[PDB]
Design a protein around this ligand. Structure first.
Ligand SMILES: CCCCCCCCCCCCCCCCCC(=O)OC[C@H](COP(=O)(O)OCCN)OC(=O)CCCCCCCCCCCCCCCCC
Ligand SMILES: CCCCCCCCCCCCCCCCCC(=O)OC[C@H](COP(=O)(O)OCCN)OC(=O)CCCCCCCCCCCCCCCCC
Ligand SMILES: CCCCCCCCCCCCCCCCCC(=O)OC[C@H](COP(=O)(O)OCCN)OC(=O)CCCCCCCCCCCCCCCCC
Ligand SMILES: CCCCCCCCCCCCCCCCCC(=O)OC[C@H](COP(=O)(O)OCCN)OC(=O)CCCCCCCCCCCCCCCCC
Ligand SMILES: CCCCCCCCCCCCCCCCCC(=O)OC[C@H](COP(=O)(O)OCCN)OC(=O)CCCCCCCCCCCCCCCCC
Ligand SMILES: CCCCCCCCCCCCCCCCCCCC
Ligand SMILES: CCCCCCCCCCCCCCCCCCCC
Lengths: 504, 100, 54, 475
């Protein structure tokens, strides 16, 4: 009953951000902050009232909250939202990253800031809708709906240093990748709906009805392949990853579009929620290919991140490697590795948010993202290189940060299932330490390699310092006390794992 | 005792002859003449089919066909007049400046 | 070796094939009316032959 | 059989459009009055549109062997009447700059609308032929209305010659079909058959040549960018919406009613044509700097998607409502796009504004037109929250239900290519570039209403689904 408002408050807030722009040019940021704080507070209230710690695994479906409303009754399509532990964690993460995105673009006093804030809130509402929708058509609708404001933000509000054509090209590549993969997923959804309609005789796009769908081996594999192609584009899984570094490099320079658009892992959630329960046998036969795609993603992303001369491109390829770890975790059928995947999703969101916000502030300071021009910046800045050192320390899987908890619980469960893939992935963790040290030494240590880095740079403001230190505190608390997060998602992960291993 | 296939084959021969004349002629007047041959061949085919079945519908379709032929020749002659007035030539290859 | 992102180029191959095929297909739109009539006749021959063989 | 008074009641939009043709022409003969004759034409079209209610109250029945009036005919008559009304509304501010006589435009639009209504009600080979020419010939006049320009005269000559060739092809195919069957009614085309008689198949092939010319289907498609660019922009609006919609409706009715619609060879030929149409139309629009040519190649691709929905007509039961929903969405999106083009070309001053450099940066002087045009580019791309996506979703569902996997993959690939060029146009609207009359405001209101309808029925499509499912023909 609060889930429709969880989606609607961002949309109404974006509309009010556009409308209240005429009242003043400093008004839309306040409106976006109020509605993002309201969405975060509603998700936190759902967390407090859900009682997820004392929830046992009763089998799929098991929702802590559920809303249903008829939308297109001809096809049996409904606005069907449902929240449980995993979805709740993703929604709270989306709200926190949305508040961070609003605070990140606070100093934008441009003439059309209301449209920027409307696009931001529409992206955030679409992401929350992806995390909440259990009607398959509604899930696909939110999935493809959140890409239009993403496209326009990248194309029109993006990186000022690049020319217009490069931003248009990056936005077009991102849109083509995501929407073509989404259309393949829509083909799979439609074919599953028609298989169920031939088996029973009724139209349904409901997740719970489509779970009990008898399919032949081979049809189920093809539906699984369509779902996985969509999720692999948005994860990213190699080779469907090329859109991501150009989308990050041409995103708006503050970083809010990286936080709102990319750093929320809807594809790993979709693999856990849909690909594994709807097609458990096909996922069981796809597990070796998906595991080796994850291994290649880890190592390819590490090598790409090391070879970047752009710091934002480096952070994008770090995201590719970490999602390779999560992809290995998802296809393993182990509760421990699934819980590690949840922790890794949250921790990667927090650490990549910190890295991208710090990179945006650094670009504001020195007006270049090329690491061949910045050097020895530890002596020039007051706070930024130390916090960047902390976040690069987190991204290599440092104990005391949640990244270590996620990565190592993934590796423990995966070794219990697949040992060879696990040992190769731990050597991938060595590769992660390599690229993090390389970024740190090329940026902030050594001697100045140009003239802009040779002079004193202004200190970080109280708002930037506050949001970065909040991310630091959250990552440290996740590293040292991950038990509330593990208890929140324990029942949902248990249901998904039991469904996956009881049907194979 | 005329076979229906013989009348249909004669109409097809006249149709492909008119189509060939439409393709191979650069003058717009000869293209309009080939179009007239084409529509008259199709109308002849309808007449043959109506005569085989003993129905008036063949000649009714013939009447509609030549009504279209008359109005099409009228419009084509107006357009040929405009082409001659605005180009001083009836070469149909000259009116080709829209492409790509 | 990998700093060029070879997998990204491998996945950019279909876009290049799309440009090439579109530029090749645009050659048929030369603007000539007699060629348009000839293409209609060619399509008629193709459609009729396909209907005859099946 | 004769014409009953009830049959006259079912004949109401045809009678009203013919009567207003006669009235507008007599008013022209009395005195040339652009405002009065435009008003009389739109009054007649609105009267036919509201007489559709009485036609619905009458019921579904046969008017002569030539016509059959059912809910399907109601839906397509309403579609072509909306297209004609929008064309007249766009035509007035364009014709305000026309130095020659402007009153004949509305006469030709009305006669073409009459042909569209006849094609909506057509149940006969005679009716189909007559409706095709009744649409085509006034469009020969309308495409070359500004014959003082190079491009309009070129497009008129191309359209006239090629449409005469297509009419000859269609008539010869009709004659071969009649020679095989002995009846020109739709239901009897294959009743005496073993359904793959060579003469019946060849006749339907030549009819396919003519009809695929009219629908810009590959390989009878090469005229489309030339005639779309050359024609006046309200004429391009009418030619993109009403002609395509009416001819595809009569093609749907013919393939639903004729027993040779179930033949495998015709289905394979149509599948090849649909595949090539989708792929070729999307590929050729990739590198187009002219908005009219781009919309022509777009129309080729969208008619390919509709053809995919028509191929599965005998297999499933969702194909006809898929075509109805798709045609409603495509009508509204094409009305918005071509109407923004027309309003940017109004008043007439010679060469219209069709280069993409003209629309580059449109938001900084025409923000509402830019918003409408970007909504239409999103809708023609089949992006969710637009009605074009609902049509694409219907096409994909129909193709999946019939196991037409080659066509489904073609729709996906063509959609990605379309995404490229549509998003290029939509984002070029918002870059940085280097009227004052109530009829122009009426055209702006028309494109704005089309944009709002596209958005609202993309978000909430169920009223359109119910309306299209109500518009069911006689089985
Ligand atoms: C896991 C693999 C198997 C499953 C694949 C499923 C498909 C969906 C998920 C993968 C999507 C891959 C998309 C690849 C192309 C991505 C878009 C791109 O690279 O665009 C480049 C370019 C835009 O750049 P721009 O600078 O504007 O152009 C220069 C001026 N013309 O664009 C252009 O210039 C024109 C682009 C037109 C559209 C691109 C062509 C798409 C054709 C369909 C491909 C489907 C997949 C084929 C098999 C996989 C690849 C081998
Ligand atoms: C480029 C992007 C698009 C990709 C290309 C286009 C899609 C390609 C799909 C190929 C499908 C090949 C199917 C081969 C067998 C067909 C005949 C057959 O036996 O079908 C089985 C069944 C219909 O027979 P039935 O009697 O219903 O059997 C009950 C089965 N439980 O069939 C059914 O019930 C329906 C089977 C549907 C199969 C899945 C189709 C979509 C898969 C997701 C997207 C493609 C993968 C990426
Ligand atoms: C560019 C677009 C390419 C689209 C390719 C689609 C290929 C479809 C092939 C196919 O239909 O395979 C059928 C086979 C079994 O499916 P089916 O026949 O439905 O079996 C039911 C019986 N129980 O299916 C299988 O056995 C699995 C087919 C896997 C297809 C993988 C496609 C390529 C993915 C990686 C690209 C690199
Ligand atoms: C880019 C590449 C970067 C570098 C990557 C290096 C990868 C090295 C891969 C070594 C693989 C070793 C291996 O095959 O280990 C498998 C084996 C699993 O044993 P298991 O399956 O448990 O047997 C009983 C069944 N329960 O494992 C074991 O029994 C022991 C597990 C630890 C193996 C340590 C390997 C490194 C030793 C260095 C000295
Ligand atoms: C300034 C002046 C302005 C003037 C107004 C202009 C704008 C408004 C236009 C109004 C047009 C009204 C048309 C009404 C059509 C339906 C009439 C009706 O009563 O239909 C009911 C009938 C079934 O009911 P019943 O009559 O009981 O039949 C039993 C057996 N005969 O139903 C049927 O048999 C089928 C009915 C549906 C056929 C399609 C609907 C008509 C065409 C609509 C085209 C546009 C559709 C797309 C847009 C939808 C937007 C929501
Ligand atoms: C740098 C300035 C950018 C201004 C962008 C303004 C965007 C306005 C969009 C209006 C609505 C368009 C349709 C959306 C669906
Ligand atoms: C360029 C467009 C490519 C479209 C590819 C579609 C592939 C469809 C394969 C279907 C196979 C069916 C086997 C039974």
């Amino acid at each position: 009953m609060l889930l429709p408002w969880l989606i609607l408050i961002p949309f109404i807030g974006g509309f009010l951000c556009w409308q209240t722009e005429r009242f003043g040019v400093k008004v839309p940021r306040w409106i976006a902050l109020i509605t993002m704080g309201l969405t975060l507070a509603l998700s936190l209230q759902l967390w407090l009232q859900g009682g997820y710690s004392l929830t046992q695994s009763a089998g799929i479906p098991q929702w802590q909250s559920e809303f249903d409303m008829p939308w297109i009754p001809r096809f049996g399509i409904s606005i069907h939202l449902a929240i449980d532990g995993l979805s709740l964690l993703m929604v709270v993460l989306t709200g926190l990253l949305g508040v961070l995105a609003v605070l990140c673009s606070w100093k934008e006093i441009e003439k059309y800031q209301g449209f920027f804030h409307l696009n931001l809130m529409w992206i955030l509402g679409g992401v929350i809708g992806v995390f909440l929708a259990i009607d398959m058509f509604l899930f696909f609708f939110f999935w493809e709906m959140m890409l239009v404001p993403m496209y326009f933000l990248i194309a029109l509000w993006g990186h000022k240093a690049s020319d217009g054509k490069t931003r248009i090209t990056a936005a077009t590549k991102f849109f083509i990748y995501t929407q073509a993969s989404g259309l393949v997923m829509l083909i799979a959804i439609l074919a599953l709906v028609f298989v169920h309609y031939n088996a029973t005789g009724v139209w349904t796009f409901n997740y719970e009805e489509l779970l009990n769908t008898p399919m032949s081996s081979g049809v189920e594999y093809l539906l699984m392949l369509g779902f996985f192609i969509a999720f692999a584009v948005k994860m990213p899984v190699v080779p469907l990853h090329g859109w991501l570094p150009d989308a990050h490099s041409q995103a708006p320079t503050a970083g809010s579009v990286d936080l709102a658009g990319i750093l929320l892992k809807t594809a790993a959630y979709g693999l856990l929620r849909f690909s594994l329960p709807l097609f458990p046998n096909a996922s069981a036969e796809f597990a070796p290919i998906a595991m080796w795609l994850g291994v290649i993603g880890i190592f390819y992303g590490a090598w790409m991140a090391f070879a970047q001369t752009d710091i934002k491109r480096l952070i994008a390829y770090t995201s590719v490697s970490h999602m390779g770890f999560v992809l290995i975790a998802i296809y393993t059928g182990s509760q421990l590795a699934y819980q590690g995947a949840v922790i890794q999703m949250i921790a990667h969101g927090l650490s990549a948010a910190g890295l991208f916000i710090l990179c945006g502030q650094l670009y504001e300071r020195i007006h270049t993202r090329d690491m061949r021009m910045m050097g020895g910046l530890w002596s020039k800045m007051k706070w930024l290189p130390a916090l960047s050192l902390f976040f690069a320390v987190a991204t290599l899987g440092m104990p005391g940060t949640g990244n270590f908890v996620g990565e190592f619980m993934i590796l423990f469960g995966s070794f219990q299932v697949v040992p060879v893939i696990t040992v190769i992935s731990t050597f991938g963790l060595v590769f992660a330490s390599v690229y993090s040290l390389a970024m740190l030494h090329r940026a902030y240590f050594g001697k100045a390699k140009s003239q802009i880095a040779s002079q004193e740079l202004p200190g970080m403001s109280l708002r930037e310092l506050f949001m970065i230190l909040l991310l630091v505190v959250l990552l440290v608390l996740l590293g040292f006390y991950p038990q509330p997060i593990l208890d929140t998602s324990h029942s949902a992960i248990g249901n998904i794992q039991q469904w996956f291993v009881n049907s194979v | 005792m005329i076979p229906l296939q013989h009348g249909l084959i004669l109409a097809a021969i006249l149709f492909v002859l008119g189509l060939t004349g439409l393709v191979i002629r650069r003058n717009l007047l000869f293209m309009l003449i080939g179009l007239e041959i084409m529509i008259n061949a199709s109308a002849l085919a309808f007449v043959v089919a109506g005569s085989y079945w003993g129905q008036t519908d063949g000649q009714v379709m013939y009447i509609l066909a030549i009504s279209l032929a008359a109005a099409e020749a009228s419009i084509g002659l107006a357009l040929l007049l405009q082409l001659h007035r605005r180009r001083q030539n009836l070469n149909i290859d000259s009116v080709s400046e829209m492409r790509g | 070796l990998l700093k060029r992102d070879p997998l990204n180029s491998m996945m950019n191959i279909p876009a290049v094939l799309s440009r090439f095929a579109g530029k090749g297909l645009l050659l048929s739109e030369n603007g000539y009316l007699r060629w348009y009539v000839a293409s209609m006749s060619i399509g008629a021959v193709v459609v009729l032959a396909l209907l005859m063989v099946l | 059989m004769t014409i009953t008074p009830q049959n006259l009641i079912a004949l109401l939009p045809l009678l009203i459009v013919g009567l207003t043709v006669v009235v507008v022409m007599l008013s022209i003969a009395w005195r040339r009055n652009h405002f009065l004759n435009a008003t009389l034409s739109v009054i007649g079209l609105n009267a036919a549109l509201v007489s559709l209610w009485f036609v619905g109250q009458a019921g579904a029945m046969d008017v002569t062997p030539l016509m059959r009036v059912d809910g399907f005919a109601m839906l397509y008559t309403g579609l072509v009447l909306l297209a004609s009304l929008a064309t007249c509304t766009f035509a007035y501010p364009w014709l305000e700059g026309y130095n020659d006589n402007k009153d004949e435009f509305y006469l030709l639009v009305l006669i073409a609308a009459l042909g569209g209504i006849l094609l909506a009600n057509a149940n006969h080979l005679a009716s189909l032929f007559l409706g095709i020419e009744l649409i085509s010939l006034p469009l020969f006049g309308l495409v070359g209305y500004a014959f003082r320009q190079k491009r309009s005269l070129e497009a008129s000559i191309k359209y006239t010659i090629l449409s005469a060739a297509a009419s000859s092809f269609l008539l010869f195919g009709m004659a071969l079909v009649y020679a095989q069957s002995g009846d020109l009614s739709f239901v009897a085309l294959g009743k005496n058959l073993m359904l793959n008689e060579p003469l019946l198949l060849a006749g339907f092939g030549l009819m396919i040549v003519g009809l695929g010319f009219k629908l810009s289907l590959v390989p009878f498609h090469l005229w489309t960018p030339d005639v779309y660019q050359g024609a006046p922009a309200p004429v391009s609006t009418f030619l993109a919406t009403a002609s395509k919609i009416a001819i595809f409706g009569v093609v749907m009715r013919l393939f639903l009613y004729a027993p040779v619609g179930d033949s495998e060879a015709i289905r394979v030929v149509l599948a090849i044509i649909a595949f090539a149409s989708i792929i070729f139309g999307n590929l050729m629009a990739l590198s187009q700097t002219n908005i009219k040519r781009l919309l022509g190649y777009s129309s080729i691709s969208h008619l390919g998607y509709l053809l995919v929905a028509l191929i599965a007509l005998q297999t499933g039961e969702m194909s006809m409502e898929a075509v109805g929903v798709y045609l409603a969405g495509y009508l509204f999106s094409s009305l918005g796009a071509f109407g923004v083009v027309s309003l940017m070309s109004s008043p007439y001053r010679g060469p219209d504004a069709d280069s993409l450099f003209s629309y580059r940066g449109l938001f900084w002087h025409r923000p509402i037109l830019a918003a409408v045009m970007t909504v239409m580019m999103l809708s023609l791309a089949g992006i969710p929250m637009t009605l074009g996506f609902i049509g694409k979703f219907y096409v994909l569902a129909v193709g999946v239900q019939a196991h037409l996997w080659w066509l489904v993959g073609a729709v996906v690939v063509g959609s990605a290519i379309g995404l490229y060029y549509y998003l290029r146009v939509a984002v070029s609207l918002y870059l940085h570039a280097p009227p004052s009359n109530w009829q122009y405001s009426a055209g702006g209101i028309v494109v704005l209403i089309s944009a709002l309808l596209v958005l609202v029925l993309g978000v909430w499509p169920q009223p359109l689904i119910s309306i299209v499912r109500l518009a069911m023909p006689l089985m």
